[PDB]
Design an enzyme around this catalytic site. Structure first.
Site, PDB file in Angstrom:
ATOM      1  N   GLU A  11     -19.726  -7.084   9.675  1.00 28.63           N
ATOM      2  CA  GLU A  11     -20.442  -6.192  10.500  1.00 28.63           C
ATOM      3  C   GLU A  11     -21.515  -7.467  11.182  1.00 28.63           C
ATOM      4  O   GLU A  11     -22.050  -7.159  12.215  1.00 28.63           O
ATOM      5  CB  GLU A  11     -21.351  -5.492   9.584  1.00 28.63           C
ATOM      6  N   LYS A  45       0.768  -1.141   0.070  1.00 32.77           N
ATOM      7  CA  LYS A  45       0.138  -0.154  -0.092  1.00 32.77           C
ATOM      8  C   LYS A  45       0.837   1.308   0.084  1.00 32.77           C
ATOM      9  O   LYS A  45       1.858   1.207   0.549  1.00 32.77           O
ATOM     10  CB  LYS A  45      -0.899   0.326   1.200  1.00 32.77           C
ATOM     11  N   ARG A  74     -25.719  -3.792   6.723  1.00 28.72           N
ATOM     12  CA  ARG A  74     -25.357  -5.108   6.701  1.00 28.72           C
ATOM     13  C   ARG A  74     -25.580  -6.221   7.885  1.00 28.72           C
ATOM     14  O   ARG A  74     -25.658  -7.427   7.548  1.00 28.72           O
ATOM     15  CB  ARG A  74     -23.955  -5.352   6.031  1.00 28.72           C
TER      16      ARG A  74
HETATM   17  C1  LIG Z   1     -13.669   4.041   1.171  1.00 25.13           C
HETATM   18  C2  LIG Z   1     -13.172   2.846   1.582  1.00 25.13           C
HETATM   19  C3  LIG Z   1     -14.031   2.276   2.463  1.00 25.13           C
HETATM   20  O1  LIG Z   1     -15.119   2.588   2.864  1.00 25.13           O
HETATM   21  C4  LIG Z   1     -13.333   0.791   3.338  1.00 25.13           C
HETATM   22  S1  LIG Z   1     -12.068   0.193   2.933  1.00 25.13           S
HETATM   23  C5  LIG Z   1     -11.752  -1.088   4.003  1.00 25.13           C
HETATM   24  C6  LIG Z   1     -10.508  -1.770   4.087  1.00 25.13           C
HETATM   25  C7  LIG Z   1     -10.626  -3.084   3.201  1.00 25.13           C
HETATM   26  O2  LIG Z   1      -9.346  -3.468   3.182  1.00 25.13           O
HETATM   27  P1  LIG Z   1      -9.061  -3.973   1.526  1.00 25.13           P
HETATM   28  O3  LIG Z   1      -9.852  -4.823   0.910  1.00 25.13           O
HETATM   29  O4  LIG Z   1      -8.494  -2.939   0.902  1.00 25.13           O
HETATM   30  O5  LIG Z   1      -7.581  -4.897   1.993  1.00 25.13           O
HETATM   31  C8  LIG Z   1     -12.730  -1.126   4.978  1.00 25.13           C
HETATM   32  C9  LIG Z   1     -13.042  -1.858   6.298  1.00 25.13           C
HETATM   33  C10 LIG Z   1     -13.754   0.195   4.491  1.00 25.13           C
HETATM   34  C11 LIG Z   1     -15.121   0.523   5.281  1.00 25.13           C
HETATM   35  C12 LIG Z   1     -16.346  -0.678   5.099  1.00 25.13           C
HETATM   36  C13 LIG Z   1     -16.588  -1.363   5.829  1.00 25.13           C
HETATM   37  N1  LIG Z   1     -17.584  -2.191   5.982  1.00 25.13           N
HETATM   38  C14 LIG Z   1     -17.905  -2.349   4.475  1.00 25.13           C
HETATM   39  C15 LIG Z   1     -19.222  -3.633   4.401  1.00 25.13           C
HETATM   40  N2  LIG Z   1     -17.684  -1.969   3.574  1.00 25.13           N
HETATM   41  C16 LIG Z   1     -16.900  -0.679   3.844  1.00 25.13           C
HETATM   42  N3  LIG Z   1     -16.384   0.118   2.596  1.00 25.13           N
HETATM   43 MG   LIG Z   2      -5.830  -3.971   1.982  1.00 23.56          MG
END
Ligand SMILES: CCC(=O)c1sc(CCOP(=O)(O)O)c(C)c1Cc1cnc(C)nc1N
Ligand SMILES: [Mg+2]
Ligand SMILES: CCC(=O)c1sc(CCOP(=O)(O)O)c(C)c1Cc1cnc(C)nc1N
Ligand SMILES: [Mg+2]
Ligand SMILES: [Mg+2]
Lengths: 568, 546
Positions: free
Chosen positions: A318, A242, A346
């Protein structure tokens, strides 16, 4: 007006058709230029920084190998999709992203034929990808289907459901795991820790390949071109870093996840909440706190350090967050689920079935309630007052300032008859005096001003606007505090003493707090009209939180205007 | 009593059970199985699921120190032997009746019921919270749960296992594998490899009908630390070798009839083929029938993908289970403006399954979501007309919700799209107008003639017939709304909002479900008890007007 000198290869690329015209030997230089372009363009626009830096090479490879937009590429969440937009016709508007009237923060079906699925909430990529892969087999042309999902997103239950279904139905779908060892903060879970690193995915029915270097564009090209032609569920595990290419971000991927405008060369409600967690846990052994992968956003960083054995990050889950809390309550501890209004959608069934039906006392601290700002439609805290309201045996509080917020957290925390929810917005309070804590009377509002003719019944943090209106119209102003149970006696009294009522909430009008007031007046066969001021019946677009609030008429000027027009 | 079941006679509490010699546990299992076959054959319910957990239930209460040690049953449809062994033997014949034992374990009913269940796959998640608390309690309380092979297909269960494998609670998960959920479990499903990779100590699969083997095995694993997984195999039904058309059949008939001439139709169910009426469909169009297992979330988002691919998906899902897919409806269908059709069964009061299964909220939680069309048929014809309407409505998702049970026998007319957001005036009256949403229309029709009232079939919860509402309000002293859905945020509350917005403060009586989880009984009994028959509807109006 695009710097061809600084970006000579990227200049020759404004569509994926142009991109696929390059010889592979030039793709590395194009990656260096895309990253350079992203680095200063996002530097000035604010927004998702280190995520996009991590997918530069992947995005170049994917659009070079896949015949997009005929071939369908789905990005999970979309926080990492800025290079995708830059390569798919929006190169010269990337600077407007997350701004009012600018590019959507994430891929959006209506913005481009290159955005197959509107995203924002996580872990939807595989599920949708399967549907489009099945469709593509039936269409019996040679349309290909691929999605990219993060190591965090793949911890969600729906990603497991989709992976299990793919292993049964065997769709022609490529899933790219963009593994950067990070969620927003560091990733958790038994999967995160997991001879074969793809043993699990093969058990789920996928052909697993990798892990491979996510920043090796030519290797990704060769490997992706191969896997694109393979049949059935395919699974390519890449490793990315990242913030790749920017040392500050490589060293602090959390801080550089979402950046303000920077030069690349008052207490918030989140903080009010985390402070209350530390102060409660300090004198009470029963307090336990839960987040679904949102430690930093919900204000729980200090809490997690000071009380590590009282803190639980369940990854992006969630659903489990809630029923886990129910378990702690069954075992006589006092759990607090910290969760954004939008993401609470969710876990709705767990709220209803595993808490409300159980009469278990779980405290829900619902952050990002109302207008969230630049994240736009997919993230709005728009419906919790409505979907929570209708469930029996649920208590629902709308603090109007940081002190009310603490009094309500405390109240719900010590309320043992069943679940309590406290919802508050992203951003800072008024500077209100923090008084000693004591349980507020349940279902009772507070008169703030006595006027005549019009009474305004405020639910939540829009109170200062209502107060400015109340003074200008000599109105009565009450802070209702409780969406459920409503202060019925108060509603009936001010109805008998005014010609019209007004309600104020930062929540959908349909089924919201003000609709609950309507229901009380109707139930008592009254004949007093009520102006329900709240969110209109469309998904709220992106912009500054103050911008969008003014746009929807939720400021003092807009509220006064609404009242006057309504009164003929 | 005692002569038939001598060993069962001795165990009316688990404390006595655990005082019996091991050698007598097999004999106990035969009598418990026989006792089961007498009572449920005369009370109805989920008895075959129970026949298959007889040995396991005996082994669990013999080995664990219940009710101190905490045992959690997933769903609960296999927990009649549990209730029989935990002091409710003599009342088991009342299970599922009005005022009887709850259908499933219920906390308020017994200290032996650790978690109220009905919805599936909650056992592991709760079991981790109970196990974490038991460790901090520091009093050697054990935790154990039983989840079936169907229930473990839900996202919920994977999230719990992923958490437990990381955090390492002291929990035993007993996988009660009988090879199929309600229908044959359909999914990717070393049989232990998934669970080991998720961090569990996996044992089995073992013979789930060998009470002495389970006893010895469970004694060992109860004393092991960290996440434990016991895979057992059981036979469903172990012991026993074996009107008008319902709305489920109506929908299934419509499905087959549409698919016959339209290859674009795809039908999806989260493991509820039989309930939703899709058995014949599944035999007739197998390549366009999709059982995604117990995964309501993936069900909806898969349908979105099919619609992005220009196919025409229909999601059959119960109102109560639709709660678990709420975020996919909002974010993956409604925000996308994708035209997915939702066929929502067990809308309103479901009867004997009680609180955990009621279709009580879909009108409320669907209606606040922008760009959703919500339709409430009043009879089987209207239900066909509305499924057709939504199927061919291309601008966005449509939901058609109907109750469990049979319709009125209404004549089935040729299919044509209904004008969107428009009600049908059925009767012009004086003074009061009744505005009906859904299948209580005939009750409302009886009242309307009795009171000489106006009567409207509203058809659409969303978008509401705003023009009709305002016209009604200018012609009558009061309005009355009717729906088989929570009053709070419900369809009639929608009407309230239109009148207020136009400053038309005409009083409205909202008739619907009161603000408590609706208890078990026959749908008719419960509707009468709630005053949602003609007699109760009239009395409500008269009381409200006094
Ligand atoms: C604008 C980006 C954003 O909202 C992100 S981003 C990320 C890390 C993902 O980790 P990654 O997949 O990049 O390794 C989270 C946990 C969230 C909040 C979130 C929480 N719960 C749900 C169902 N949806 C979400 N979007
Ligand atoms: Mg990630
Ligand atoms: C009371 C019996 C009942 O309602 C059952 S039972 C069973 C099979 C489980 O299979 P098993 O776990 O025994 O192997 C299903 C699929 C259902 C419906 C259902 C659907 N969706 C959820 C979230 N919850 C449910 N309860
Ligand atoms: Mg292989
Ligand atoms: Mg089963």
């Amino acid at each position: 007006s695009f710097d061809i000198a600084k970006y000579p290869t990227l200049a020759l690329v404004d569509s994926t058709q142009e991109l696929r015209l390059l010889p592979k030997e030039s793709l590395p230089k194009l990656c260096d230029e895309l990253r350079r372009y992203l680095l200063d363009s996002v530097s000035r626009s604010s927004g998702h920084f280190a995520s996009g830096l991590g997918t530069v090479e992947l995005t170049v490879a994917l659009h070079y190998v896949y015949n997009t937009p005929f071939d369908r590429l789905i990005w999970d969440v979309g926080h990492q999709a800025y290079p995708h937009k830059i390569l798919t016709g929006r190169r010269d508007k990337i600077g407007t992203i997350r701004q009012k009237g600018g590019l959507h923060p994430f891929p959006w079906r209506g913005e481009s034929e290159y955005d197959v699925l509107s995203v924002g909430h996580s872990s939807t990529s595989i599920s949708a990808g399967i549907g489009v892969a099945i469709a593509a087999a039936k269409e019996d042309k040679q349309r290909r289907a691929v999605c990219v999902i993060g190591d965090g997103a793949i911890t969600a239950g729906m990603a497991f459901e989709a992976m299990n279904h793919a292993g049964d139905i065997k769709p022609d779908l490529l899933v790219v795991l963009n593994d950067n060892e990070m969620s927003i903060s560091e990733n958790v879970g038994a999967l995160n820790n997991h001879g074969g690193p793809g043993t699990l995915f093969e058990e789920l029915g996928f052909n697993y390949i990798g892990p491979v270097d996510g920043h090796d564009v030519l290797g990704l090209v060769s490997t992706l071109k191969n896997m694109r032609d393979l049949k059935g569920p395919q699974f390519l595990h890449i490793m990315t870093k990242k913030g790749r290419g920017y040392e500050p971000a490589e060293k602090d991927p959390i801080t550089f996840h979402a950046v303000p405008k920077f030069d690349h060369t008052l207490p918030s409600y989140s903080k009010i909440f985390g402070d209350w967690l530390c102060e409660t846990a300090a004198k009470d052994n029963k307090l336990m706190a839960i987040t679904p992968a949102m430690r930093e956003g919900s204000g729980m960083v200090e809490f997690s350090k000071k009380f590590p054995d009282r803190y639980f990050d369940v990854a992006i889950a969630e659903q489990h967050a809630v029923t886990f809390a129910a378990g702690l309550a069954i075992g006589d501890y006092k759990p607090v689920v910290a969760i954004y209004s939008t993401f609470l959608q969710r876990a709705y069934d767990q709220v209803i079935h595993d808490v409300a039906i159980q009469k278990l006392p779980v405290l829900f601290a619902i952050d990002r309630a109302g207008i969230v700002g630049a994240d736009g439609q997919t993230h709005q805290g728009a419906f919790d007052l409505s979907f929570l309201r209708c469930i029996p045996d649920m208590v629902v509080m709308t603090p109007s300032d940081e002190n009310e917020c603490r009094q309500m957290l405390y109240t719900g925390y010590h309320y043992s008859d069943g679940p309590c929810a406290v919802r508050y917005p992203r951003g800072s309070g008024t500077g209100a005096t923090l008084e000693p804590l004591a349980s507020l009377p349940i279902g009772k509002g507070v008169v703030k001003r006595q006027g005549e003719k019009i009474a305004i019944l405020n639910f939540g943090t829009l109170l200062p606007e209502a107060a400015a209106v109340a003074d200008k119209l000599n109105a009565t102003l009450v802070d209702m505090r409780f969406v459920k149970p409503l202060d019925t006696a108060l509603i009936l009294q001010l109805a008998g003493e005014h010609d019209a009522l007004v309600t104020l909430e930062e929540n959908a009008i349909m089924g919201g707090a003000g609709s609950g007031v309507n229901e009380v007046l109707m139930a008592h066969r009254r004949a007093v009209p009520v102006l329900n001021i709240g969110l209109p019946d469309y998904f709220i677009p992106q912009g500054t939180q103050e911008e969008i609030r003014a746009d929807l008429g939720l400021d003092a000027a807009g509220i006064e205007a609404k009242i006057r027009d309504w009164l003929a």
